[PDB]
Design a binder for this molecule. Structure first.
Ligand SMILES: [Mg+2]
Ligand SMILES: [Mg+2]
Lengths: 240, 240
């Protein structure tokens, strides 16, 4: 039926998007781990700068920086980036999340020190190759705007969008940047994830909403699809 | 209509797959360029090995090797790889293509020196940082079998298959590897690319063929579709 067709298509769209999203995030983590491994091999300042200032790194991340435990100094790849004169990398979420985990992690969303923009960072600790002593942490900042734009390149009957959330409904990435880091209830009017496709009313209008898990993080992708438009589009695909 | 649906589907297969193929290939080129730039920064052999032997590089490409202009020595990332005593990288197509171009290129298909398998390589020149002098070339081998599998992940409901050709009709990747590096006429019976959906007769039977360009290489994604199968499957979808 039309309803079963709409429901099955919505299931398929969000399942597909969760696969693409996992690949995007894994690609970012793989680049970050590669750069980190090269830094661990030789963490001399000149080498660090070479590694993090190449086009691949500049294009993949908003900003990359290596903060040192010994003195709270840092080397980063943006001479203009200014978090203020008292900034200490050692007290930042990316630094402590990497130190505490002892391995690559992605932070929860947080506010950038310089811009106030909500982002997440891939974060990695750096160990002495001989002794295993913790030397500091590296962050690789991920634009949530670019992430939302990327995940929304899928065909969604020309009226609908894809978003990403944590297990607890915190918005990781939404086409409207204002929602990043905010509870998904601000745009959905539901606060708990219901994975299975279901109806959500926004401003008197019905939408189909569905979620799918993202492999490698506790995240989920969600879709919000105009029900009127989807039904009409598929009815045209059926009757005529 | 059913007719419009089938014709639109053929167009959408090649358009969508040419976009995803561009993304994948561009990602792999960007990794090759990054490794190349780090090698140019410090081409000492142990540093080169460190750069090319990390899992990111080993998982992205079949094999990576840097051939030197001075003596035809090489540094590669497979200790199980031995090219024989007289193998000279300076006479190989990846080497000459990179030297001629003076920039990152992807080779036409050629036979691997060790395995004989038809493949392509991402290939880059390496310059001396101080003098600008050509030091040699690096290859990053790409599996055509893997590429064929990748472009065929798209839903085709057993109606056909997807393939890749270059501008001159040379097969880059076909599900049946025997066609790789051979003229596409061996499986299509036509040699000239017509991008617009058109009918071809293969063994007395008509098929729909269409192409879409890949941004970044002189490549096209092609599809062959049995409309007898497509029409039946899309009619089933229409009434589901
Ligand atoms: Mg999933
Ligand atoms: Mg092209």
């Amino acid at each position: 039926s039309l309803r079963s067709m709409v429901s099955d298509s919505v299931d398929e769209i969000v399942d597909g998007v969760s696969k693409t999203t996992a690949e995007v995030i894994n690609g970012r983590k793989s680049i970050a781990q590669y750069a980190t491994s090269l830094i661990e091999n030789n963490p001399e300042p000149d080498n660090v700068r070479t590694i993090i200032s190449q086009p691949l790194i500049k294009n993949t991340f908003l900003l990359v920086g290596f903060g040192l435990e010994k003195d709270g100094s840092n080397i980063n790849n943006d001479p203009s980036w200014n978090p203020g004169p008292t900034w200490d990398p050692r007290v930042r979420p990316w630094y402590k999340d990497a130190k505490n985990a002892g391995k690559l992690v992605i932070t929860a969303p947080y506010a950038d020190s310089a811009s106030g923009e909500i982002l997440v960072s891939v974060a990695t600790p750096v160990k002495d190759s001989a002794t295993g002593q913790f030397l500091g942490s590296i962050f690789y900042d991920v634009s949530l705007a670019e992430l939302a734009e990327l995940v929304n390149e899928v065909k969604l009957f020309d009226a609908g969008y894809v978003f990403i959330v944590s297990e607890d409904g915190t918005t990781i990435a939404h086409p409207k940047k204002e929602f990043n880091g905010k509870p998904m209830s601000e745009f959905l009017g539901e606060s708990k994830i219901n994975v299975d496709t279901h109806q959500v009313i926004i401003n008197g209008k019905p939408y189909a909403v569905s979620f799918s898990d993202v492999e490698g993080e506790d995240w989920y992708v969600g879709v919000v699809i105009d029900e009127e438009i989807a039904y009409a589009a598929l009815d045209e695909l059926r009757r005529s």
